[PDB]
Write an enzyme that holds these catalytic residues in place. Sequence first.
Site: not given
Ligand code: VMX
Lengths: 75, 954
Positions: B428, B426, B434, B437, B476, B556, B500-501
């Site tokens: 991010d 991941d 704020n 949680r 990914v 999220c 999430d996408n």
């Molecule tokens: N709708 C439910 C909440 C979504 S979440 O639990 O916060 N998950 C999102 C999470 O996955 C990352 N994201 C998006 N696309 C990604 C790819 N291609 N590879 C790895 N991570 C990816 C987002 O940055 C969130 O951390």
Amino acid sequence: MQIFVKTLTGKTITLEVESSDTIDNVKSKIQDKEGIPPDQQRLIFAGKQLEDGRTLSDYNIQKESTLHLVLRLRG
Amino acid sequence: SNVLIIGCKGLGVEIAKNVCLAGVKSVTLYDPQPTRIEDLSSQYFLTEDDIGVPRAKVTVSKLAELNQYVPVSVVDELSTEYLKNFKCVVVTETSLTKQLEINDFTHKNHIAYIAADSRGLFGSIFCDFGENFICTDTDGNEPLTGMIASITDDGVVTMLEETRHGLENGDFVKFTEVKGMPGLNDGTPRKVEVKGPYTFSIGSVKDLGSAGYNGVFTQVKVPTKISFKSLRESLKDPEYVYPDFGKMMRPPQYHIAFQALSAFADAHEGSLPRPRNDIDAAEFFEFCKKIASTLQFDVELDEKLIKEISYQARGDLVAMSAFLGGAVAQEVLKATTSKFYPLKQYFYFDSLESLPSSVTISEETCKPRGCRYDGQIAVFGSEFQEKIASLSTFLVGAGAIGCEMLKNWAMMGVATGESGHISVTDMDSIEKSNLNRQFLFRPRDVGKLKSECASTAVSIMNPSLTGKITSYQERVGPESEGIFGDEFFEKLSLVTNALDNVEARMYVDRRCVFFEKPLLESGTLGTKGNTQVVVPHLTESYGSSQDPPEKSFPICTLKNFPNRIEHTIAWARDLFEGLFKQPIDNVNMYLSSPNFLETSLKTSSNPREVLENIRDYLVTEKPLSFEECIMWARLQFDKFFNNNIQQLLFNFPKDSVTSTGQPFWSGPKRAPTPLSFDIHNREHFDFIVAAASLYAFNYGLKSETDPAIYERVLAGYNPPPFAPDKQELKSIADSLPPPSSLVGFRLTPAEFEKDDDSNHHIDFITAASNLRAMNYDITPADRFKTKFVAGKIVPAMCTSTAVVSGLVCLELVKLVDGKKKIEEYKNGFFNLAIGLFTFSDPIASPKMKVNGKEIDKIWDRYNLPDCTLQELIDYFQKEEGLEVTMLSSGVSLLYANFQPPKKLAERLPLKISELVEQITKKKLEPFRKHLVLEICCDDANGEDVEVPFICIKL
Ligand SMILES: *NC[C@H](*)CS(=O)(=O)NC[C@H]1O[C@@H](n2cnc3c(N)ncnc32)[C@H](O)[C@@H]1O
Ligand SMILES: [Ca+2]
């Protein structure tokens, strides 16, 4: 006959169909009621997702049956 | 909104986690039972070094660390009159007799009561909110609204052109801006009677006018009195809530069996039937017969199904715990907030299809071994446990869903074996927020990679995973195919999305289809969620179907690299909260509670921010005139659209790389560019105006909209330039003024409200959103569009996340068992706002006949070498009797049988790799091992015969 269709959003749809109507016809009636393409409708009855080409009798759907219109979420 | 939770095993601790993350007044625990090793099968706040100690005592430390605004305490005794200090009482791991007593008391004193039990693959929930419970929102959906064409004198409202109203019989609606009928726009709701998808009656309103035209109708949510019956008077004829209409005859069986279980327990010194034992099962079935003859329950008892509860009486699965815990936490939220329609009243659920068949499930296999996996083995068997240990997973995403999935995999012992291994990824990073949680992520964890922090927390939960979790930081997609390549998949067992996408889901789906690897997929949307499974050569893939256009937008957690305007809208809302709410509440409670610092030294998980808020908002940056508020706004602009981006670029230059070497900057939206303030630019000016107005509203000072004052003050103010903790906190705290200077000074906190247009709230939202969009090159929006899109943002809820995680793990145990019949898998869908669940067998993959042979349109394929186009055509003609009419790679058309022979003579003798290189004008990277080609062919009759794709090996 008359069947019911409940949605994830909690909305009920009464449909006036016959015993041998194809799944496609029920999807098109749901379209006329709400306006969702059949290729995007997910109809579930008794643990089975209604596929096109079949009929309501093929899934043993009786009067006052309750189908579920659902969809996939991405969040 | 006080809550009590009796029982701190897997289910109880899950309920407490979700109730704390969701947020309530207080949370109280009660479970003095000594800790047992088996408890660690589904309870993630108990360590193997905590055996013999009460459970609540050791979990309160980890539960209070979740949410700082929700204090968590423990009680060692339990009185009857004590239960009046709680808005809701939840009961787990409790005999039916004490349950009856407690429920009698609560129901008599109008106190919400929720009982829950997880027994193997079986689960029970019961709710009772008193005989006079009030629910203000019956479905949670946002109020409907529409454009009215006309309204007859009898009440026949008609829609504009062909607009649908989507109302149901019983809904109430009010009207606005209705020409012809003045008295209808006041606001008095009127009952709706639908007579079609475009018209509906509201009753004779000809006293208000002879007709109406061009209006706007809006739905009104009416409260409803729900009358619940006590557990005692409802035990004879209970009202079920079916999770699967395909299992319509099971809820009564479970209603009797969950009582017979408590009876068997009472009759054997509290012990429960041994795992997979037959004589215990016979005693249990006779207890069922007794309880059925006493309650006068006219039902034929299923012997095998019932005894399957005795066999699985000691089962404590983390998936069931997560599922039912999310559900019960949302029910507690319903009880406290009086929103959403609760379960009424009994809910009996099973995932019996999860039971293994590839291994032996006897008493000798399920016997307790004396470890953490006991509660799980009792269901699946030591043998099966090893299959779980020897797992190779690829988790895509480390968000809330990803963290839940990792916690479940850890409690289950996934990948703990010798060959097992976990691969998380991941891109991010953990950033402050704020208003958000998280389960594993702490405030101190800010600045880290989500994947690595989650791996660390998981290892803390089950140290047996240390060294088994490779945590990548990659996005990914197509660029990352160098790391997540052939070697990466050939070792994997299964893939699991926590995304999430939709684009990422589709890409992962295509990859899994290529490498023939199972996929687990989950998604959420406020209180709704879905779960899907993809099994090679069995089901169709996630991309084999399309969904309706999204009506709302789920958030999220704030994203580090925004790409759509909704991200900047959410970010601007979080900024609004951080600027005109939390510091002001800090100052308010500082001048209202005498021991604010003495207690903040402990409660707050970031006392530095509390002290800095008090300092800057009360003295260091105290506005004394609207011009000083304008200066403050200028400084905030510099801070949130200039300096922060400069520091970001200094920490991640445009050419930096990740732990593996890939470009740190994704690709879709490049790195941001800072902003240089210029009042002549109207976005900057609008931000200045809105921020100054809000900061002046905080201190009661009068705001102005005349640009003259802004020009005056900003012509002679330029904030300072910018270029990229033990004693400091105490020195700052001692540098504060005495709280004894209480002059009733109230700092009006900003309570966010969107429907008003004179409070400068949507102004600030739009300005900040568009400035951050400009930062990251995003199409800005205007006042109206920003308001609209903000009204359609839904924050994901921890409950739906836990539910989808549980269901996904229940499907994972099927995937590892090797189940090959589609009837045994289950795609799930749920809306917690209405207690709605549904499950359906996946859709089988479409098979097709080619040359008289059945082949899977999605999984089977042709594997050929890097031949020449002519060689491939000849192969398909002589080995398959197919006249290839089209051959394409990606979105590039390589060969077609109608192209002119000049264009073909230069492409027939070329190798497919060389052909692709020439057509694409872009050489093949060295690490590509395979190529994917779509083809269209015709048989000997010239009729197009659909065929699979081709995997050219090179
Ligand atoms: N709708 C439910 C909440 C979504 S979440 O639990 O916060 N998950 C999102 C999470 O996955 C990352 N994201 C998006 N696309 C990604 C790819 N291609 N590879 C790895 N991570 C990816 C987002 O940055 C969130 O951390
Ligand atoms: Ca006995």
